[PDB]
């Protein structure tokens, strides 16, 4: 099963926010067969739930270093995709 | 070294910020081959030249939807690694 | 005898790996807790107050 879950490596967010982000990423990836389309669906879910505008970076190879705000940040791996999504504003 | 030729197929960002980020990315790629360090340098240069805050990500197999500000989301690839400097705000 | 010994040596190595994993996980958790406490102190009480 395509599980976009995470372990305790670097996950600094509200628990509900992190669970919703992981679930939205997994649902978008299941709904869309393309990476860009899954990104579009996940961004639509993010802009609907945590308001506009929120982005999530998820892929096999990636890297993020920015101003990760408190209770809305993540830098981990969600399945085969590296879940590095931090929301600030 | 590394062919740090940033060909922006889709450049929905400021031309000056994109050119400065491309020059910084070429210098960083000449310095080292760390894509994470290159993305961090691009994000830092974009945030310094266009205020806080700017985020840039470099990877190989990833699909992300940019939720950024206007004239600040530069997606320039030095080859195939799409270094998308989507300055969120 | 050498086969059982190689098995025992692999078992000792794996047990050492597990024990070192426990010790290193405790150390990493303590370091993460201390770093989180310092970051929370900095975020709540700004140094340039």
């Amino acid at each position: 099963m395509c599980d976009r879950k995470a372990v305790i490596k670097n996950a600094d967010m509200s628990e509900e926010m992190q669970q919703d982000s992981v679930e939205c990423a997994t649902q978008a990836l299941e709904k869309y067969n393309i990476e860009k389309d899954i990104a579009a669906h996940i961004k639509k879910e993010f802009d609907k739930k945590y308001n506009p505008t929120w982005h999530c970076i998820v892929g096999r190879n990636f890297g993020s270093y920015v101003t990760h705000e408190t209770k809305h940040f993540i830098y981990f791996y969600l399945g085969q995709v590296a879940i590095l999504l931090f929301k600030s504003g | 070294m590394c062919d740090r030729k940033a060909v922006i197929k889709n450049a929905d960002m400021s031309e000056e910020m994109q050119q400065d980020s491309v020059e910084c990315a070429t210098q960083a790629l000449e310095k080292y081959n760390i894509e994470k360090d290159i993305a961090a340098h691009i994000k830092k240069e974009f945030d310094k030249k266009y205020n806080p805050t700017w985020h840039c990500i470099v990877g190989r197999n990833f699909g992300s939807y940019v939720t950024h500000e206007t004239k600040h989301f530069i997606y320039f690839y030095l080859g195939q690694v799409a270094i998308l400097l989507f300055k969120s705000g | 005898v050498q086969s059982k010994v190689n098995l025992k040596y692999d078992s000792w190595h794996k047990e050492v790996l597990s024990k070192f994993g426990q010790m290193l996980g405790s150390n990493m958790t303590e370091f993460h807790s201390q770093i989180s406490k310092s970051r929370q102190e900095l975020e709540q009480h700004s140094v340039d107050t």
Partner: peptide
């Protein structure tokens, strides 16, 4: 006003192995 929280989540991201 509200400031900007510089609580960076530092973790090195490796490629697929």
């Amino acid at each position: 006003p509200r400031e900007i929280v510089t609580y960076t989540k530092e973790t090195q991201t490796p490629v697929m192995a």
